[PDB]
Amino acid sequence: SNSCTTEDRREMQLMWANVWSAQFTGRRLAIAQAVFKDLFAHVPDAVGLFDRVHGTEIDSSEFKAHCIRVVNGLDSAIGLLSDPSTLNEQLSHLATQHQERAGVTKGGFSAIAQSFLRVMPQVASCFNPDAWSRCFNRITNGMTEGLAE
Amino acid sequence: SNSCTTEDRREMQLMWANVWSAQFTGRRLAIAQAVFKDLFAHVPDAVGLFDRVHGTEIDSSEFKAHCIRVVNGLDSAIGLLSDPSTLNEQLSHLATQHQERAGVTKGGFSAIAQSFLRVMPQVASCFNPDAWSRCFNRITNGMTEGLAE
Amino acid sequence: SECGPLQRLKVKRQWAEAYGSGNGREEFGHFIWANVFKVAPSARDMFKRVRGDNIYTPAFRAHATRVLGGLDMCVALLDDESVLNTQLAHLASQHSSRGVSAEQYNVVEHAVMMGVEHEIGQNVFDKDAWQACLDVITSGIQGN
Amino acid sequence: SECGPLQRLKVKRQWAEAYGSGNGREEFGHFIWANVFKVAPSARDMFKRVRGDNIYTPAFRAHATRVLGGLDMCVALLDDESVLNTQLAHLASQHSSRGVSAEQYNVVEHAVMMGVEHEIGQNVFDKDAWQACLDVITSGIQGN
Amino acid sequence: SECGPLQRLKVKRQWAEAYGSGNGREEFGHFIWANVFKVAPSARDMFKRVRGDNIYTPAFRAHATRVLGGLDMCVALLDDESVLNTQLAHLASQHSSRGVSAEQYNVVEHAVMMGVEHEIGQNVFDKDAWQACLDVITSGIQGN
Amino acid sequence: FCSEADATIVIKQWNQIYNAGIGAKSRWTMGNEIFSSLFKLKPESEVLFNNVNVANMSSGAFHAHTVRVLSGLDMGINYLNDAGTLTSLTAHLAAQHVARTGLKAVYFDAMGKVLMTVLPSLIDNFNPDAWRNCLLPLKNAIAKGLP
Amino acid sequence: FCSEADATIVIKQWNQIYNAGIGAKSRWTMGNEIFSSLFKLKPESEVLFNNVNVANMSSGAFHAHTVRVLSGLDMGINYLNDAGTLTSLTAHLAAQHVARTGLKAVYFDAMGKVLMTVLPSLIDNFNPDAWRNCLLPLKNAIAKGLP
Amino acid sequence: DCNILQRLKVKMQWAKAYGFGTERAKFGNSLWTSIFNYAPDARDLFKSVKSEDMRSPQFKAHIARVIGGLDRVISMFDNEDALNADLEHLKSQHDPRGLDALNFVVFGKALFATVGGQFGVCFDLPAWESCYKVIAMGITGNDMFS
Amino acid sequence: DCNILQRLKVKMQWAKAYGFGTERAKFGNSLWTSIFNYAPDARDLFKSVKSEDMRSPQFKAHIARVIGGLDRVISMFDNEDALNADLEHLKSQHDPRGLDALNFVVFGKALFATVGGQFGVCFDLPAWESCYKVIAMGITGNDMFS
Amino acid sequence: DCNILQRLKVKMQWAKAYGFGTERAKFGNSLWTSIFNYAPDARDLFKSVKSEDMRSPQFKAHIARVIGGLDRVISMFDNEDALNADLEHLKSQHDPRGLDALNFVVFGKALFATVGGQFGVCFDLPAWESCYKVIAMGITGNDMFS
Ligand code: HEM
Ligand code: HEM
Ligand code: HEM
Ligand code: HEM
Ligand code: HEM
Ligand code: HEM
């Protein structure tokens, strides 16, 4: 079915909590920077989409704050998988935040989906790539509603 | 002893809850109308006591609203059997509501007591007539304090 | 929001859960009227005959019993427009000579809503449905 | 009191307990904003787009989700002065055209403190550390 | 209502349940004074020496300990008129140079009543007995 | 006498205000309130307690009387689930009252109304029906044979 | 069809508003709201219900139709954990709809959006993802073979 | 018979014995095990739904439709208009199958044994006999259910 | 009709539902509670055994006698001579009481709901109906039970 | 002896070992089983309350009055006026029975064994010996309890 099931939702929150640091950005920053490094090394023109947050300088305070915002947004969505009504509202707000930006398409999300599939097993224990991607795609489906292919 | 015991109180609330409808008047209305039909067919002059609520027209909206009030008052009293202090106050308020009405006596309550004893087993499962009447009489004893025989 | 057929069904089921069978009714009614007299202490005077000064007395607890029973009759009749209007008119006559302001009906309205939410949980409480259907009830008790 | 290195560590751990993993976050956020709009009902108007009239709607619950996420980012950055100022400036721009008064920032401040205390217990709540470090956060969101 | 011999016995037993042995006393005292300073924030200034700004500090918790101990001595003496008046006069001298208004004694009175009720439950709380016997206590602490 | 669930409620509410770990001062405080109220409903009955110095209700003799009256009431309550023993206990209490000249059964009716009046002021969630279901058989068994 | 945990959520939320202990008045109240909404999204489909007196949605014939439609929906929901039986149940429902002239598969798409719209107004903590994961396989299995 | 009080009684006991989820299917299997044990000749009438194997998905589907039909008919007991309309709908479905009305008598017996066996001793058998007659009369039109 | 196989089934299901010890008293109380709930006017027919209070020792003794008669009649279902001798003996005790035979129809309904409610879903209602007719025919002699 | 501290100690341990409800009767039965075992000749003194059968309602009533008397006397330990008045009342009841004072010594021993056996190892035997002397002195007036 490839649907993000209730079982897959529990597994993703387990894969996420066993890596998430609730008190210090050291682990969040590391995962995020590693994801965008993987994204930039696979999609070279994507770095120009983050000119405002110093995308070329991954260790700048400006891109550190952006990385923290991206992981915070993913963390809120993973938690809201248990409450899909509120999740649908949050994924719409994220969609308009990624709208009206030429270069931000559905192809970049499929690329960052691969980035997470390569970063997560290096840092997460008991990682389930099947269950992870089924719900990650469920999350990105709401983030890419009004975007180009 | 013929007293309404704590055991009989639990049994009456069980007999009542297994018939009471908490959301729709369909079951309350049916029990009430069936009780007054039984009362009127046994006490013919009692219909004239309810001229104000269209006693002769049992299916009028005026007598439907009266029936709902009677069953609501009995439901409050059955629940308050667990708190007899508050029950004694509620049964006094019901007494004055039935006072200053010629024709409303202790004989009509003994008749409606029989009406309930015939209606309830048709609609209630596991009906205990002994335990029901001991506490029903306890309830009517407070409702008929300052009434004629 | 409108008190439509769907909202009446939701309010019915949520009321039945909060109102319950009879065990939690004393606590349910106490929570409501402690909120009422806290938000509007001046309303206590209209309840002189039923010990509005002391809502812990058996006299006031029986009054709170009657008030909740009146709400239960209205909620159970939300799907029966004809009979609901008749019972609402009966409640109107019971408050006619008491000078109950439209501000107070909303105070009790809010206490009832806080009480149901406190009983069933903010996680499921439908504020729009409860607000729209209690408006229909209170507006009928005030004549219009 | 001052939001020093020790107070930042205590606030971090106490926030992580109150904020939790995700199960109690809906109740946590509801408790906060029910306090906000009770102490200041006039603040509801600024939340027209996210259903400030009804904090039970999925629309407002997502807004409360974003607000708590913003606090989580700030608390997680209290030990990183450089990055914390950057994120605080990002929050400042998100509230720049909204006319948020210094009185309101303290109202939400108090609701957040009551919510964390309600979540972790008055027995362990460090009021001085929380007050001093939330001041550092709110003062950065107001520019200065 | 009057604080007669029967009401003194009821207040004694209900206080012993709420006050307890010592485990819930910190929570009991916190609930009381959080109510006091919420209803009357201006009263915090008289508690400068015992950290009235922060009722979570060990300094104020010890003050709340002494206040509850003073109530415990009075309640335990409600059946001993002679000794009760002596201890009430001792409390009066402890507050003589502090300018405590009659409005404030009633505020703490109400907080103590809300705290006992919160501890033993509205289902058993005797408001008339508690109000009449706390009046006897506070009126003795004010001289008369 | 009364049911086991009713007796259970009466016994638990009674131990709440009366037990072995209760100082005698509150014992005769309840006794004085009970008998003072009895003398206001039936002033004719105060003369019957002259042998225990009813003229001074603060005396040791009258304090001891109310103590043993409340102790007898406590004994009856704590044997509500032993109907055979309660019958013998109340028969003994009846003989201790029938032998006293001037006692009418109406005086025990007034005592019942005094207990129903005083006890709610002392007991949490006083259950007047459970108490009526148990006290009234006690009252009649003690007043059995009284004029 | 859908997972056991998803089906468990759908079944529990459905029994919340629909079960055997629910009077038929609220049954057709939900049915009338559902079909009235379907006729506002696809007014062309109202003609297909002429045999059950859709002209008067208060009639016994149309009340009975919505009752048996909701009963079929209830039957599918309560067999979500029996995939073999659900396949046969939905194949029977498909044959009962393919034989009806004028039915398009898009009409069942509109019914899905009506259910996703009405049910949150009735159900506490309505889970739209668990419902989509289970209803959409039901909808396609009933609309299997429709134009 | 089958007055309004008995209709509510039947709705009450039905909802309890019918249950939720998979217990619903166990009730239905018990109902049909009794029908075929009471009248083994009735089994051959249901070869179109594979009565040869009561565990097959074909017959489990038939069981679900039947007990679902009982549920919706019992739920409409308090509204004559909808009830009779649905009973007519069920009649138009069973009429072309030329069924002996004596099997609807067998169905009732098995239904009483299954409901009462699941509900317990407070089962109101007179009420169920009277109100099942109303159902069988609507589906068959046969006055043996008068 | 009540053939030999139906008699074996009824004996078997009775023995299971009847039980041991105090289960019989509880079984008997449910039977007579159902009788008086099915027909409240029949209660006045038992003033000789203090039917005003069903927990009284006089009525509990009557309950024991009745379910003892049911148990001994059912046990003799397979011996025509002993069975008919006891039914005639029971007939001679009930006849001078002028009982309306319709009450024995009500008794049967309560017996079926009680045994079925206790025995469970595999209760054979047609077997019990046909064999109770044999009992009620033997006691009342009324061809209503033919 | 029996100072104010020992009186409070005795009131404490008495309330614990005495208990509530039916445990009170078990304590009393144990007390009187010990008295009659310590001095079998004392049993004949209580034929007026049917000591021939300690399970009879007559002797159970006597047990209840006695341990109730201990309870009320112990409860008044802290008020000399009421205590002595009640001890005089008990003296006027026991005097006409011409009882050997040596049995009040036996009563104390049995009381210590029953209270201590129920209270556990923290039983304060010196305090109970001293304070029981105060009780026995009030009831008998005999200076062997000096
Ligand atoms: C799961 C995947 C993603 C999540 C959770 C996410 C989340 C976020 C969040 C929370 C923000 C902050 C917006 C604000 O504060 O106003 C943001 C900004 C942004 N995102 Fe994403 N994002 C994701 C994937 C992507 C991808 C794949 C792209 C492009 C290929 C992208 C492009 C951007 C851009 C251009 C911005 C704005 C940069 C700026 O504000 O300076 N995002 N994103
Ligand atoms: C358990 C038995 C009964 C209960 C619980 C009960 C309860 C009630 C209640 C709640 C009302 C509404 C009063 C108001 O809203 O102001 C009422 C009205 C009334 N009742 Fe009863 N009642 C009972 C038996 C009877 C009987 C036996 C009679 C007469 C023989 C009677 C005569 C009346 C009358 C005349 C009214 C006023 C009619 C009217 O307002 O138009 N009631 N009763
Ligand atoms: C909004 C829904 C309300 C309901 C369902 C309701 C219900 C009731 C009922 C059933 C009674 C009993 C009348 C009788 O038996 O004679 C009553 C009495 C009363 N109500 Fe309400 N009421 C409502 C609102 C209010 C409000 C908002 C106020 C005042 C702020 C109010 C003030 C009173 C007073 C003063 C009485 C007289 C009680 C007495 O003295 O006996 N009511 N109400
Ligand atoms: C004190 C810490 C606060 C934090 C961490 C915070 C956080 C946030 C965040 C993350 C957003 C989302 C902005 C976006 O995504 O576009 C937001 C929006 C908003 N905030 Fe705050 N905020 C705070 C204080 C306040 C206060 C005190 C007020 C008003 C009294 C306020 C009023 C608003 C409004 C009106 C919005 C617009 C929401 C909308 O309409 O979409 N904020 N806040
Ligand atoms: C009503 C019952 C009250 C009781 C039983 C009580 C008891 C006490 C006690 C035992 C102390 C300790 C004094 C010492 O050790 O020196 C104290 C101190 C104090 N009380 Fe109260 N009090 C009561 C009411 C109030 C109220 C109503 C107020 C003010 C609104 C108040 C204000 C104070 C202050 C300012 C102190 C000085 C504490 C310090 O700075 O060390 N008291 N109280
Ligand atoms: C629950 C109610 C009552 C109980 C449990 C009770 C029990 C007792 C007991 C245990 C005694 C002492 C027996 C002894 O000497 O060993 C006593 C004495 C007495 N009682 Fe009662 N009694 C009750 C009510 C009454 C009432 C209503 C009267 C009304 C006149 C009454 C009149 C007396 C008198 C005159 C004495 C003797 C006083 C004396 O010793 O001089 N009692 N009662």
Ligand code: HEM
């Ligand atoms: C969850 C969705 C649906 C379910 C469970 C469902 C189920 C049913 C059932 C059980 C029947 C009655 C079968 C019988 O006669 O025994 C029926 C009839 C019918 N349905 Fe559906 N249905 C659904 C959606 C739809 C939709 C979207 C349409 C759009 C046109 C539709 C059109 C019809 C028609 C025309 C009939 C026949 C009415 C008649 O008897 O005259 N249904 N449906």
Ligand code: HEM
């Ligand atoms: C109250 C009693 C009964 C009810 C409520 C009932 C209900 C139903 C229902 C809902 C269907 C499905 C119609 C469809 O979806 O196409 C059905 C089909 C059928 N029924 Fe009944 N039924 C009852 C009794 C009986 C009896 C006693 C018999 C035969 C002895 C019978 C024979 C059949 C047959 C042969 C089918 C069609 C099987 C097939 O689809 O191949 N029914 N019934």
Ligand code: HEM
């Ligand atoms: C259907 C199976 C029944 C059985 C096996 C049965 C059995 C018995 C038995 C064993 C006795 C005791 C006779 C004696 O020892 O004096 C008895 C007594 C009696 N039976 Fe039945 N009975 C049945 C049905 C009924 C019914 C339906 C009624 C009336 C509705 C009835 C009315 C009576 C009466 C009035 C008595 C006299 C009770 C007395 O005062 O001793 N019996 N029955």
Ligand code: HEM
């Ligand atoms: C602390 C020790 C004792 C206490 C507190 C005590 C208390 C009592 C009490 C309360 C009664 C009931 C009086 C009444 O209600 O009429 C009683 C009766 C009696 N006592 Fe004692 N007693 C004690 C020791 C003894 C001893 C040691 C003996 C004899 C060896 C004894 C012999 C009797 C007798 C014979 C009766 C009367 C039995 C009857 O009623 O027929 N007592 N006592």
Ligand SMILES: *[C@@H]1O[C@H](CO[C@@H]2O[C@@H](C)[C@@H](O)[C@@H](O)[C@@H]2O)[C@@H](O)[C@H](O)[C@H]1NC(C)=O
């Ligand atoms: C009434 O009794 C009060 C209590 O005092 C105690 O009892 C009296 C009878 C004496 O024995 C005394 O020694 C006790 O301490 C007295 O305080 C009070 O004065 C008495 N009242 C009158 C009017 O005599």
Ligand SMILES: *[C@@H]1O[C@H](CO[C@@H]2O[C@@H](C)[C@@H](O)[C@@H](O)[C@@H]2O)[C@@H](O)[C@H](O)[C@H]1NC(C)=O
């Ligand atoms: C629509 O139907 C309403 C419901 O009445 C019931 O159904 C109709 C078809 C008749 O059978 C009637 O006897 C039933 O009571 C009617 O109340 C309403 O008048 C009808 N509307 C129109 C416009 O005809």
Ligand SMILES: [Ca+2]
């Ligand atoms: Ca309003």
Ligand SMILES: [Ca+2]
């Ligand atoms: Ca601040």
Ligand SMILES: [Ca+2]
């Ligand atoms: Ca005061």
